[PDB]
């Protein structure tokens, strides 16, 4: 005669996955902005 609930922990691997690939997409975006700027000068 008894019952029980249950809780959950996230995976360690995940860690700060919010920025694991955010930093990387931000870095690529910076590269793309540099590309865009250089192309703007070249077109001019």
């Amino acid at each position: 005669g008894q019952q029980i609930f249950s809780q959950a922990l996230l995976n360690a691997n995940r860690r700060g996955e919010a920025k694991t690939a955010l930093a990387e997409v931000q870095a690529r975006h910076q590269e793309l902005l540099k590309l865009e700027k250089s192309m703007a000068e070249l077109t001019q």
Binding site: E31, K34, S38, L42
Partner: peptide, 19 residues
């Protein structure tokens, strides 16, 4: 690496066009 190569080519072409 492909994007860095593209950037390098664009910078070179900017130099040639300035010339």
């Amino acid at each position: 690496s492909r994007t860095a190569e593209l950037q390098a080519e664009i910078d070179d072409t900017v130099g040639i066009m300035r010339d």
